[PDB]
Amino acid sequence: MLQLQRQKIIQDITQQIRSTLNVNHILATVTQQVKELMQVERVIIFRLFPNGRSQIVEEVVSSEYAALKNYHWEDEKWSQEILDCYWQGKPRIVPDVINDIWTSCLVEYTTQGNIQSKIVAPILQELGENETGRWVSSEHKQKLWGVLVVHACSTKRVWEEDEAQLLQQIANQLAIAIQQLEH
Amino acid sequence: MLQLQRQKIIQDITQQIRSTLNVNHILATVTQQVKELMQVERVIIFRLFPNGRSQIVEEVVSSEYAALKNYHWEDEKWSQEILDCYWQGKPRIVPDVINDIWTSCLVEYTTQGNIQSKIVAPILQELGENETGRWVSSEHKQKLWGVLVVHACSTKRVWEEDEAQLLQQIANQLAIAIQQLEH
Ligand SMILES: *[C@@H](C)[C@H]1/C(=C/c2[nH]c(/C=C3N=C(/C=C4\NC(=O)C(CC)=C4C)C(C)=C\3CCC(=O)O)c(CCC(=O)O)c2C)NC(=O)[C@@H]1C
Numbered sequence: 001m002l003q004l005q006r007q008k009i010i011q012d013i014t015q016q017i018r019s020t021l022n023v024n025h026i027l028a029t030v031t032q033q034v035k036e037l038m039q040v041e042r043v044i045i046f047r048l049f050p051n052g053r054s055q056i057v058e059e060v061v062s063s064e065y066a067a068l069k070n071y072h073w074e075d076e077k078w079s080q081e082i083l084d085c086y087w088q089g090k091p092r093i094v095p096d097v098i099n100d101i102w103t104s105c106l107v108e109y110t111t112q113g114n115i116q117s118k119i120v121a122p123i124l125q126e127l128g129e130n131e132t133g134r135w136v137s138s139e140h141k142q143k144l145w146g147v148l149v150v151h152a153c154s155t156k157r158v159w160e161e162d163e164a165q166l167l168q169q170i171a172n173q174l175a176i177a178i179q180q181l182e183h
Numbered sequence: 184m185l186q187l188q189r190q191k192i193i194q195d196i197t198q199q200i201r202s203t204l205n206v207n208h209i210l211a212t213v214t215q216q217v218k219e220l221m222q223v224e225r226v227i228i229f230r231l232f233p234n235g236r237s238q239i240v241e242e243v244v245s246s247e248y249a250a251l252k253n254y255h256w257e258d259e260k261w262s263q264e265i266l267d268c269y270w271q272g273k274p275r276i277v278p279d280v281i282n283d284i285w286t287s288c289l290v291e292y293t294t295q296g297n298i299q300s301k302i303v304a305p306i307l308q309e310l311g312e313n314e315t316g317r318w319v320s321s322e323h324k325q326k327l328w329g330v331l332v333v334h335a336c337s338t339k340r341v342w343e344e345d346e347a348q349l350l351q352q353i354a355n356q357l358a359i360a361i362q363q364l365e366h
Pocket residue numbers: 044046056071072073075076077078079082092094101102103104105106107108109118120147149
């Protein structure tokens with residue numbers, strides 16, 4: 001009978017509960033908006049895992065440049081002078097990725113991605129109590145889950161402070177979204 | 184300048200993160216769908232707190248009958264024979280709320296709400312580790328967060344098993360949504 005129609009909404013209802021409740025769906029929609037908003041050729045979420053590993057877990061590329069999605073690496077060491085900047089919740093404006101001495105090893109990554117300038121925006125976690133790893137601060141009582149990055153690839157773009165300011169605002173909004181959705 | 188327009192999306196982006204991430208927004212949208220789907224005059228989420236208190240925290244009434252929203256009570260004791268049924272994850276079909284001996288005290292509540300029949304659907308929580316209260320089972324390793332109820336008010340409605348079956352499916356979907364969103 002039309003008991004058929006009862007489930008045509010139950011599958012909807014479940015579909016939304018699962019949709020909204022999974023982290024990637026809202027990661028994937030924020031980045032698709034950061035991209036269309038800042039008119040930037042690529043938006044990635046570089047995720048850092050405390051064992052050392054790290055991976056671009058979401059990405060929104062203009063079709064012109066490579067899918068750095070899933071791009072990854074193990075035992076990721078960042079320059080101390082840079083994590084300080086990042087634990088303080090401060091974005092990082094890299095107006096010339098090419099001569100950026102802190103990213104002087106992501107030359108492979110830089111040239112395939114074809115990145116000219118970029119803004120890097122920490123995603124932080126107030127993780128109190130007990131957890132220790134590679135991306136964690138005791139001075140700041142905060143953990144660095146990953147990084148929202150935005151890639152100027154077509155031109156060496158110059159960034160206004162409000163651009164970084166803004167990306168950081170959005171990053172700091174993900175931070176809250178992610179702390180909830182980790183099971 | 185048009186730096187104005189940068190924030191007209193940031194307020195959107197934040198608006199969605201906050202929207203999706205707060206429990207009530209998805210409680211309120213499920214019930215508005217359970218209601219429009221089962222053609223039932225009222226849909227409530229009766230929430231049970233372990234101190235004893237309990238309250239109708241969301242509701243979707245047809246404009247014809249009272250807002251039992253926020254309707255509440257303290258030191259709520261349910262008949263043991265009934266929690267067993269509920270911890271097992273089994274909905275309860277009450278085809279005549281009026282002569283339901285287990286709800287023989289919600290006569291005030293029944294007559295204002297004007298409830299003729301109803302389906303009652305437990306919302307359960309696999310709460311392991313350490314927490315004990317009034318709504319918690321050791322036999323079933325499960326806690327009873329609240330109850331999704333559906334109220335036939337216009338007529339003493341008869342319910343097909345699939346109707347209860349279905350409401351329970353939806354209840355069991357909330358259970359997963361709520362376990363995530365408690366901070
Ligand atoms: C070189 C000095 C070291 C380093 C720099 C560094 N990397 C990031 C962020 C990223 N790291 C990667 C991935 C890689 N790390 C690697 O060491 C390698 C192999 C060479 C790879 C492929 C990626 C993809 C990023 C994100 C880059 C992006 O802009 O999307 C940073 C932080 C961000 C910044 O630009 O400030 C830094 C400083 N990381 C190391 O592990 C090296 C010892």
